[PDB]
Design a protein around this ligand. Structure first.
Ligand SMILES: O=C(CCCC[C@@H]1SC[C@@H]2NC(=O)N[C@@H]21)Nc1ccc([N+](=O)[O-])cc1
Ligand SMILES: O=C(CCCC[C@@H]1SC[C@@H]2NC(=O)N[C@@H]21)Nc1ccc([N+](=O)[O-])cc1
Ligand SMILES: O=C(CCCC[C@@H]1SC[C@@H]2NC(=O)N[C@@H]21)Nc1ccc([N+](=O)[O-])cc1
Ligand SMILES: O=C(CCCC[C@@H]1SC[C@@H]2NC(=O)N[C@@H]21)Nc1ccc([N+](=O)[O-])cc1
Lengths: 119, 120, 119, 120
């Protein structure tokens, strides 16, 4: 269950993840299929850490959107079924930029995503 | 302006130390949690994240790989600067526990908040 | 998109909801397919409110688990597709009972559920 | 023991009033939020929920049907009593916005926290 490779989720987004180093750290690139303003979407870098020893590791990563002031974090676990098929089960928080601390209450969206490997 | 570099404490008493933020907004550091499911096992743990660079009050996210647990936490939030120049990180977090198989996935994710201010 | 009726979700849970009154309030009964201790599962009452005027209303409800000290809240929206098929898209928070306020940080689980009508 | 009956204020300044808790733990009341997406539209709004009855520090949940918005909020939490008998509600919430169709569902749910103490 190395996060290295190419993935798609239930919203149609795709991400590519590079080699996971000995500390479990990885970089990659995220293409979201959806956005507040979808006409603005550009490829956005991600940076995260997975656990290394576990066969079905937990992990987290941050996506710095390159077309928005927002940021998303994803966390989840990679599972392997009896046929060797991998799924990333994740939850996410999406932080929007607000003007000052008095607007903080409305700044964080939550959701889920299930990822599978592209071919 | 708001750079996450430096030492911070939160409302639970945890301490984190963030190193240099690079020109992409990437940063690393360490996180010493005050609380855990098994606090007798707590050890200093690494974090890795990204903040926005241009904004004076940037949003950001980071991941903490706990070195004593199979779990992982992610934090996201915004750094605010008030009229006196005091900085606060307002964050929300998700903590993913390791479960045995996908049938237990539903119970694997905790949610919460944390407010951080600077040590010094 | 009246919540009245019989529903199942992606985890295999089922719920039955009674008549929605003029204020949008409803009661019902929830049978979860999963629990921390599944051998203890019993039917549990729910109580909530939906919006009335909207064709695709938002709503919320609370489930008082009758076999646990925990409580779950669900919120979401009822959608109708081109064929007239309804789906409840929901997110939930599950509050566990902890001993004192110093344990509060670990007391709230989050997740999703998609519900469809039973037949 | 902890009955949600009475008036409470939260960290955002909102006020809610909970009526009698029945023998099932069900309660109704009203919620006056201090903040909204469009605060010029705020009106007093009804809530309905259930708490546990036997526990001295019960968990609970409630739904607020905003009377001025198509959105709905749910809150869940626990009532704690400290060594001096002071009560605090520690809660987390989800706020569901109304979106036009299912393709926008992903952006429809906000999350947050609130801490409540008694008015009086
Ligand atoms: O649009 C944005 C930036 C792109 C976010 C894509 C999200 S990441 C969670 C989910 N999973 C995906 O694969 N893609 C979506 N930011 C944003 C979105 C909504 C709002 N809003 O106010 O609703 C503000 C900023
Ligand atoms: O205990 C752990 C690892 C350490 C988590 C510390 C959390 S990070 C969010 C919050 N903010 C802090 O500063 N500290 C806390 N993992 C864990 C926790 C609970 C459960 N559980 O099942 O409840 C399983 C694993
Ligand atoms: O087990 C319980 C009570 C039953 C909860 C069922 C949940 S409601 C969200 C989800 N959707 C469903 O249809 N069913 C599940 N409470 C509980 C669960 C886990 C923990 N825990 O610590 O992990 C503590 C209490
Ligand atoms: O504004 C609204 C309706 C009022 C919500 C008040 C929230 S309930 C959680 C928090 N605790 C409080 O005491 N008050 C706040 N709905 C709404 C809000 C934001 C958005 N949005 O898109 O950001 C859409 C609808």
């Amino acid at each position: 269950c190395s996060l290295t490779g190419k993935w798609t989720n239930n919203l149609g987004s795709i991400m590519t993840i590079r080699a996971v180093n000995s500390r479990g750290e990885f970089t990659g690139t995220y293409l979201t299929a959806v956005a507040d303003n979808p006409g603005n979407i550009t490829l956005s870098p991600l940076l995260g850490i997975q656990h290394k020893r576990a066969s079905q590791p937990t992990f987290g990563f941050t996506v710095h959107w390159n077309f928005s002031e927002s940021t998303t974090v994803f966390t989840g676990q990679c599972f392997i079924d009896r046929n060797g098929k991998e799924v990333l089960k994740t939850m996410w928080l999406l932080r929007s930029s607000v003007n000052d601390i008095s607007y903080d209450w409305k700044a964080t969206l939550v959701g889920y995503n299930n990822f599978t490997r592209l071919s």
